[PDB]
Point group: D3
Chain length 321, copies 6
């Protein structure tokens, strides 16, 4: 697996740096796409695969499969994916957004914000990114920013989530839950809350999980978004925390500064201005390299690069825990 990479520019001191090829996925890649801004990406085969949020010209929210040789240039299917489901009630499509994908043990799991009398977390698996078998929704509405851990945590599946409401939710804590079987969920634990505005305002309104947690010797590296409320709306930035390995609802370090915030025209102008919303990462433990995918202005998808050891140090050095 060769992950995408660009070397940190000369004299850049930032922990993460934007791809000079951003945006890597344009808003109009498909004949009917309005925007493409969640890219739930993983290695697959001799390349990469992913589940993409592609909102169409009707402003419907759909998920599409994509493939790529280099993880930068994507061939996304024109037709939305369809989930196969034994149960007619759960298998009913209303809408879907916020996908996340990860491989656990023997297959790829997809979670997404699935409408079922409100936003909840849908769950499906695939062996091949062609047929997807839909499982029970993991939780009762309202919930989103569902993000699985990439292995079992002491014998059970684990998921981060984000209790919400039925609108543009003005609050949001990260939570942790477990399941023995991808059907029945429990042992719910609070992970963290928005910071106080006077401490770290980029994350003081609400927060939610981003990429699949990345295992490091110093804890699970969580890349997560945070919201700040100005008089003219919300600004979405993102940052990092380290979670205990065995009890990942225990936050050990949490960054004060953001890692990335809306700065470039493609992040500050578009369907929802001033949004950097991380959705996936690819990483390489040998080199420490990480590549983070993020939606820009809810319009296009970008990539940013960093080193895991540098991120860990930044997280601990600036920690507000």
């Amino acid at each position: 697996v060769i992950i995408p990479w660009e070397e940190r520019p000369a004299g850049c001191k930032d922990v993460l740096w934007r791809s000079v090829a951003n945006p890597i996925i344009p808003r109009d890649l498909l004949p009917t796409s309005n925007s493409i801004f969640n890219s739930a990406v993983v290695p697959f085969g001799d390349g990469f695969a992913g589940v993409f949020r592609c909102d169409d010209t009707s402003r419907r929210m759909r998920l599409h499969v994509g493939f790529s040789k280099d993880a930068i240039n994507w061939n996304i299917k024109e037709e939305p994916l369809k989930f196969q489901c034994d149960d007619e009630e759960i298998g009913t499509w209303v809408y879907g957004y916020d996908p996340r994908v990860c491989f656990i043990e023997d297959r790829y799991y997809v979670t997404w914000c699935n409408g079922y009398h409100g936003p909840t977390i849908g769950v499906a698996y695939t062996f091949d990114f062609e047929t997807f078998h839909q499982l029970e929704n993991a939780f009762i509405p309202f919930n989103r920013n569902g993000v699985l851990f990439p292995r079992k945590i002491n014998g059970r599946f684990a998921m981060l989530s984000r209790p919400s409401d039925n609108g543009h939710t003005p609050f949001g804590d990260i939570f942790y839950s477990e399941s023995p079987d991808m059907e029945f969920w429990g042992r719910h634990r609070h992970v963290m809350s928005p910071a106080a505005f006077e401490v770290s305002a980029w994350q003081c309104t609400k927060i939610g999980a981003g990429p699949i947690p990345v295992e490091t010797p110093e804890g699970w590296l969580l890349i997560y978004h945070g919201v700040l409320h100005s008089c003219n709306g919300y600004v979405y930035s993102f940052g990092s925390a380290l979670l205990d390995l065995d009890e990942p609802w225990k936050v050990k370090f949490r960054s004060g500064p953001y890692l990335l915030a809306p700065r470039e025209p493609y992040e500050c102008m578009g369907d929802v201005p001033n949004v950097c919303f991380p959705c996936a990462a690819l990483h390489d433990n040998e080199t420490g390299r990480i590549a983070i995918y993020y939606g820009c202005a809810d319009t296009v998808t970008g990539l940013a690069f960093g080193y895991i050891p540098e991120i860990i140090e930044f997280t601990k050095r600036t920690s507000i825990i």
Copy 2:
């Protein structure tokens, strides 16, 4: 021997209020401000319950109570304290909205438990002296958690009511199952508030009340509904019938309310215009049912009816 009063003569109402309401006064304890949830079950030679008693600090606490007749209560002055092996879950913040039922071999208690916002707490007891707390069933925000009094195809089942962090302006009843009273899933929507032009007493939000009452025709669900006036919410309650095997499937749902705020003790107090049903005792032999409900979030009331009359009213006036 559950409490009973015959319908007044000439009264054609399906439910009739006890002539002795309120049956529990606001100031029964030395520091109680209000007492308005009564989660009542038969126990040993008499009755037991878990009661929401808000104190003079306006803190929300649960207290155990006992009664020989189910009308006159001796409520413990100390609040109930749960035992928990897990210190994280075992931390008390607040508690309201209790419900109590016997399932297979023990009594279970659910309540709206504070855990970074309202969720549904779960505990068991054999004796109403020691309570053993289990995992909270769901992530916040959730309340009106009401267990079924037996397993449904080999699993525990619970009605709930996803909510928000404040005075929630919405709310559907949901249904979930668990094999072990720890892990929960198979979530199914039961019902939504009605359109205001169909049935406005239940058009803002709804929530389950007493434990479901099994009948040959399905589960008898007594639930509250809210109407939003310019000067606030009005809580009334009514009746539905749920499928026996798949209780998320609603068979019949009443258009009219069974009861709504009328009397001064319902219409004046800490939260005016509230009738909030929280428990029921019934006898299948005679069809008699006795429904406990909170009045004005201040005091506790009792109402009477017959199960076959309620069922016929529910079908005849059904908006499904």
Copy 3:
């Protein structure tokens, strides 16, 4: 022979409540939850009315009533249906806020009629048994439609109250005309809520109540006003005098109210703290006026006064 009761001696109030209030109870009908609009007129050897009767489903429906004395009413159990040649307009969604007056050859009914939101429905009857529905007078959102009881310079005329899709937090009274009871126009603003520092009982929103009463010095308009407290709205009512020929021109408007919620039947009920005037009977010969009003959106009450006194009060306390 309009209803009347003498001024309690050593009462100096412009209006005084009937000692028999409430004159219509909430449960007069077997399925009524509340009865609090009574759009009353003389008819044959007695009186007839269209009443807002909300049922135990909290649906809003209109029912006909009859009475020998205008105090004790026999209201039909079944809601009235309108007859309409146009299927789209004749679709019933909900109805409230009725008003009734005789114009020239027949009685006209207006009400708040649901047609993709609140608007003003219009109908005529000759007999109070069959009602023929005409075009809704305006586009939503509008209510408190009140016809003048004769034409104003060759046209039908109506007061209205532009509103929104909810519990509207604003409301001016407007005036409109129509040559044919179908097409409406020449809209003119009558008045806006007062500044709270001047007259706070009518500072949030106002609306017309009774059919305007012709006096030789202009139209007596009895209208409700709303005050917004931290705990919701308080509805009181008062008086204005409109120019005879151009009734959008307000000549005098009272600073103080005439009546405000005081009694328990006004202060406790489905919507607390509401006195909402809906009709009036009067006798020019004696100057007597009898004013019907909804109490707490639950029951109907009556109040009495003298036209000349009300006019004097209106001029003397005028904020215009």
Copy 4:
């Protein structure tokens, strides 16, 4: 009558395409103009005339007359338009915006959102775009987006409107009404409501009529805006519907996708970000060509081009009715 036209760019598949000379009217055309973003345009004499919303440097909303040879380059009068009115109360000017202009039988009629104890629909006529005779306001407040039909229907004048409130209204259905005399109005009928967000979210908060309805054998072509509410405010897009010829409150087809939505910098940045608000169109039945004027970010005016038969085919094929 030679309407403005540019061909569809090479390989463009879109039903409408933007003028490459956008914006066609700049914000600062008049000495005190702040913004010029409604252009109610008609053929007149040997060229074109129009009534324009020009908000000045005091942010007052005024209407101005303009003229043009080619309908792209405009000479707008510096002085605001004054209406003559026989009734001094109705003739009182508080503010005006949202103009629309059309010729009905023997004269041009102007409607606008006119302040009369709140927004309502004002009405006037002119024969020459010099003297304007003000008629009665058509409706009681609150209402705007008044748009006349360009001929009588069943022997009456007809007008689409849009019941509103006293603010930045968070709802809005399109209504239809008739008048025998341009004075008394009635026979009010509901045309359509915002769509469900799951179905077509660009038009799920509110909608309102745009250009004068365009007669086709297939019904009235209505171009209308719709609003989507994001966390960061409203996004105005526009689309198309076909109304029954004889009973125009009856919608026959209604597009799922939008025709145009904010995409270019001049639509995304300015006084009100993310607005494409259609206001007028010129069309030529012989060729099928249509040119649609629309306000961009409440700052400038743009043009877009299409073919009426293609628009109708799109409206039908993608219909949500």
Copy 5:
């Protein structure tokens, strides 16, 4: 000789309502709609006060009252007019929330005075006949202004409550000093609403009531607290002890309330569920204190207690 009624036998309550409540009715004056702030002090061989009397126009005015026994009040019909040499500050817009205390050589009156929004008006009087207006103490928005009854280290001192332009959803008590009753500063935060899970009767906002009472253990502050239900605000009141020398430092603060809306005259009226303390008379030799408070923003009521008992209560139940 302060008013006094002994505690009923068998009552463990720290305060008890007078059995003759309400002591001032809503209709005492010819045009009074409600009378519910009574800023009372000893004066001559009896008592005086400034009273908030809202009229039938719902305008908020202040009127002077006198009483020989402090229970039965003769309140003047004419609103009080302040004399002021500056016409800008002297302009009357509205006035409510009065408080009155003697400091050194005269009586001082504070009130919520409209000056482009609510702020704290200040005046003095020697005789309760002429009132001389001083500068408003603060910029809007502020109210619940309450002076200390002597200087604190050579300065006048005042508690206040920063607010907004509406029915304020927040509110901390602050402390400020002035050398000269014109320029104010050294602002210090006294306290904030409590967390709802700790003491919900005081979790939305709080504000000072009676003039602070000097005790050997600190200043006894009686203050109101607000709880926010789905149906509005509930106003209760409680006690704190402030440091004698630096009175922004709170030493003790009651978890429970001392009094909360319970009787019909507190629960029903213009603003339901309000007990708003506004003044207190006390006798240090016997420990007796008589607390005046508004009831449902309609009438005025009286409650009694013993200062040593209130202190012990405040200490024993302190949440700090």
Copy 6:
């Protein structure tokens, strides 16, 4: 003192013109700066000094001292400034923004929006822009936009303020207060309220003082911001008023039009879009030159130039009183 100046562009008829080198202070000037958008600038020594609002990458609001030879190119201290205070209660730092600086008789005074149980006006002095001595907060919360007068008025210090609330306040009048000693404040007077929307909508939601009042023979020249509320948020523009010399709460003239409104990409895009927030001015009575510093989009700092006599004449001739 040689104040920065650029000559009025040929053809330009505006009363103020933007520097051709805007933004003069970039958002990333400091190693940890997210945005730099208030520049409270004064002559000092052989050049200029200032207190600057620099929000960091944690989105904390801090004040930093800066120095410049020319008042355009600034050397801002990396470390936030710290206030010295004898009282521990008042000396507690929670947050600070909205700085203003002016020399009064013998020292420089700094005001800012200081957190003390909500937003209030902090006050400090400095002789050297190295040590700052904090005084009592001038008012009880909630208040901001505190701006001292640059000399005493009838023997007293004087300050403009702006009573607010605990959020993004949807209202705002300018008030005036006095103090004999920079400790006790009083004699509060209403200066002005927002204008009616039908008169001057750029200033109809709220208003607040900007630069230190500039004394002229015709009154105090107040440059102030005004807010307009669109469906998509607030737009901040600024204009001018003349206050009576002896009783500065008496407004004598107040402009109808604005002087400046968000127009350029650096005013329209950034952390808070569509904001032009004036915070300071340098002026020369001999030449009438004035240079006005202003925050752009709450991101960067810009400069604009004008002539005081032109501004006085514009203010009077366009007066809405």
